[PDB]
Symmetry: D2
């Protein structure tokens, strides 16, 4: 029969956290990056990857001025970032809360190959995820991140890949909700290949339908969840060009056909597009004439920090310049989230 | 890859029909009673079940005065009703179109038992459904009806029953959309038993999630479909009492957790409740503070025709009385559809 | 919980029928051809398609001498063939029983296209299948045939096609078993295209695994069922050549990886290969060193009748010649079924 | 299309390992027990749980005399047991190989609760399972163990529990096969409750069908796998008594309806039954008149070590007594595996 996965108090707490994350005008700063994931970004400048460099970069992202507060509703942190401190001794989660944001943590442990598939991968990280999520909850993290990676090929994504990614996302969501942490479901579809907008929309619809069927199967409280889907965009190698309005229409149509309205908000990821392109696409999505029952906010790792990283240059002199670049990008992304961004 | 089930013109036609059916203030008159299904209703008076009697009753339901036009956006007819005419020789589908309504047809061929299940049934009617739907399209039927019956027991509905009903609903929807006919997906859950509101909501969420996963699997154009779910209500034998606001909250919550917003509208069925109760529940559903992205209209067979049948009495003298009663009930149901029904 | 789909008496009857059909040395004569299906075969000779012509041809197939009795364990008939009579007035089902065979009927109503798929089809025929199967049981038919057609393409068979074909096969099996009729599950995979033996084996394994998962989901009594799979063979357009031993190894390996041993027997279909090729492939399959827990018999439509049609010529003078040719082919196929066929 | 999960060399190695494990007359000694899992067994005597006590007990189980060599085809070890040595300095995996056995390892990391279920659990351990399995392969482990726990209740096992356990078993099997390690699929069904033999058989059939469908979906090489199912037995609280022949018939029937013959062998677990009862049930299973295409061997944790533990008593004086007790029990279990056990 009906065995309640969450009590009404747990559901209320999850809904409150989720609505706080994607409150109107607020988005997510995806500051989560592994040691090797941020290694390439720090090597783009020439500055070495150390604990102090990582801490200072994340402090620069997190210790922005008051203008970021109504634009960042959540920050996804890496495991080490959740336990680093600001220059004044303030812990990074407490820095995030003091600015009105919601502390998040990347709980997935990377992607692993799926045998018998054309390079398809599934995401691991469910081992001890209950204890890890409980500890993150005691450490200030109120929501979690789980990146499931799918791509588009001549035979990809297959039934096995979509099914397994949806199942692992549903299990991660169940664990996070049991631990009082809002799960952000991220069935990312890589914009790699020559696939057009139509194929990306079809694949996104299939992936999201399977993801939400798995969430229903795992008794996931959708009001206590957020979605982190790829923007429906043509592949990087696609020759045909689509306008921002076309991309927005395709993305909103894909979301409306799969995502139930109970989902508190949809926090898009950049997916390899430039900062200006991501902001304009988010603005067009929020300006789509189709009725959108969810908060179509942003959860950007590169689209919010690329300019700040370039301006910073790895040296302390450009702290203010990089902070200003990140702040103006967050302002632009919040405007796009409200649909009022005009570059 | 992506093989288009429907061309953009077919999708546009289906969306236009679906939006016409559930345009604001309009609902569905379910006159899709078989010869044996209407036999019990005609025996409640004492009037014999006759082709002429059935024709006159359906003409009475259909030939109401002009004030019922903006309240009925669709009428589902039986196979024989689609080919009967009014007293003036006007065909019943043409009578429906002349009043601004959309002609519908019940295309399912009844329910059949599922072996190995606790009295669970699946719906048949897929044989030659393409040719039947094409003929109905040439005969004026712009949408179809398929009643899938589920109930709640100690071990019911099972995985097999929900999966099979969802699969057959998706196949029926695919056939109807290929034939240019808007499919009304009706995964009705019987309000039989002592199950409470919570169990009904859980079962409705599971059934609707499976139904829409099957619709996604069958490449169903959800904008060209309508949903006919049971109102989330306690069982008929349930001792615990629930307010209309509680029933509305449960129903809207179940719909928001499973139904994608792309669905043009949700047309509730009575499900064995009285006319006043059904209208009040629909009004409370449309007054629910939760955001509702779809047209929450009515598709009532008994809640729209029970008092009209009682007033008619099987004799021609109460023709006008039954017209008046059915028209006032349709006005009340339209007000509930707009959320402005105050009895 | 566990609701028994079949009583122990029904299970015993189904097991008895299934074991009678595929008793060692016995196979199935697939004599079921629709009016248009046999129209092409009769036009290949030059003789018109006539009720009398069809009756005489099926009598020629069924009124063979005593040497066919231990070689044919079942005969699948068309609906009209089940009610035709021999020249002496003996009904065709009674003719089949008098020879020790088991009367079968084709209960599927053809294949219909699946929308959104690359030319993929699903099989219809579930409407009133319970009443039809009951009537066939009263008319002497003890088993039924349901041809589900799948093919291999660059994106085919898809998840939807395999899932829907398996589901419809499971529903047909449930109905047949409820009506006391042994269902022959036929998830035929067309040997059309340039796909190699490896791809055919992979597709056969996936299709059969889905088919038997659906049979388990529908509570199908596998001991009262038979399987009619395509022999794992390269496509007709495949350039690479495979020996009969390679084809047999691939087929037996695909069956052992998917088919549970509870299945009473596996009755292969020719699938567009010549009579001698089909017999040699069946012999090699039965000579495969891998352990085979089921009766690997034959259910051949063309591989038992092509030479019979060629000899017959549509005229009564070659009745004996066509009977002798069919009898020798049936003896060869029985020898292959026992693994002792040496051409 | 068909992307080979395993090369023919990998498939050959997995088949060789699997056939070595369940070679006729040989079974598995399930010596895998966590520190807390063996803590209760060591506390049953009164001897403290230390590293040295565990090492001596596992050495006793592994360094038995030569008469246990043809009875044990595999030994499942815990993580710490794989890295302990004998008294002479021989590593435990090398001790196992020197006796003709195949070294196994418990790779699952325990069970975790499933939210929304009636106490149902899923098994974790997929994080870094590729690296762990590769290291175990370099450390002598040629097969792995993954215990998935299902129980029987009024609403249990549910669709979510069976589906999730099958998915995680298939993922574990895929990882193990990619790492050259034979996966032993253990969808254990707890004999807890008052459920009878019929319901246990029904649940076992459903669980095994879902497990093998998941294995097919994950492209698992079934010839390189072994099955560790529960014997189909009535619950511990079941009042109705079933004979050993009835239990054997139910178990063999459940296996034949769901397990494909490609599975190299079936290694039953004790499931909380006594040593003599487990051996007698295995003997009856191997004496079942139904045709059994797989090696129905034993993989017993308590049914091979309970008497040895009682005899040992935690003191070195009963080393030889426990040796003889365990060896006689293993000989009895091997005789049951061959069907020649007469107590």
């Amino acid at each position: 029969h009906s065995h309640p996965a969450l009590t009404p108090e747990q559901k209320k707490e999850l809904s409150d956290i989720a609505h706080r994350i994607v409150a109107p005008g607020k988005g997510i700063l995806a500051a989560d990056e592994s040691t090797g994931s941020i290694a390439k970004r720090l090597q783009s400048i020439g500055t070495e990857n150390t604990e102090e460099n990582r801490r200072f970069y994340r402090q620069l992202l997190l210790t922005a001025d008051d203008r970021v507060n109504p634009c960042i509703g959540g920050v996804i942190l890496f495991h080490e970032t959740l336990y680093q401190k600001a220059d004044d001794g303030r812990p990074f989660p407490q820095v995030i809360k003091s600015k009105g944001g919601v502390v998040g943590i990347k709980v997935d442990k990377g992607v692993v190959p799926l045998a018998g598939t054309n390079g398809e991968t599934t995401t691991q990280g469910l081992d001890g995820l209950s204890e890890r999520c409980a500890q993150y909850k005691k450490d200030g993290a109120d929501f979690a991140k789980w990146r499931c990676v799918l791509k588009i090929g001549e035979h990809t994504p297959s039934a096995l890949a979509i099914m397994e990614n949806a199942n692992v996302l549903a299990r991660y969501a169940s664990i996070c909700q049991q631990n009082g942490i809002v799960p952000i479901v991220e069935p990312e579809i890589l914009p790699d290949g020559d696939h057009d907008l139509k194929r990306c929309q079809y694949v996104t619809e299939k992936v999201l339908a399977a993801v939400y069927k798995a969430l229903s199967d795992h008794h996931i409280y959708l009001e206590g969840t957020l979605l982190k889907p790829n923007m429906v965009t043509p592949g990087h190698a696609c020759t045909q060009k689509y306008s921002h309005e076309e991309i927005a229409m395709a993305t909103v149509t894909a979301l409306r056909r799969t995502v139930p309205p109970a989902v508190t908000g949809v926090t898009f990821l950049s997916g390899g597009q430039s900062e200006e392109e991501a902001s304009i696409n988010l603005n067009a999505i929020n300006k789509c004439p189709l009725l959108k029952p969810w908060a179509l906010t942003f959860s950007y790792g590169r689209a919010l920090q690329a300019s700040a990283l370039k301006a910073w240059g790895g040296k302390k002199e450009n702290l203010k310049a990089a902070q200003e670049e990140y702040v103006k990008r967050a302002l632009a992304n919040s405007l796009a989230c409200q649909g009022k961004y005009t570059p």
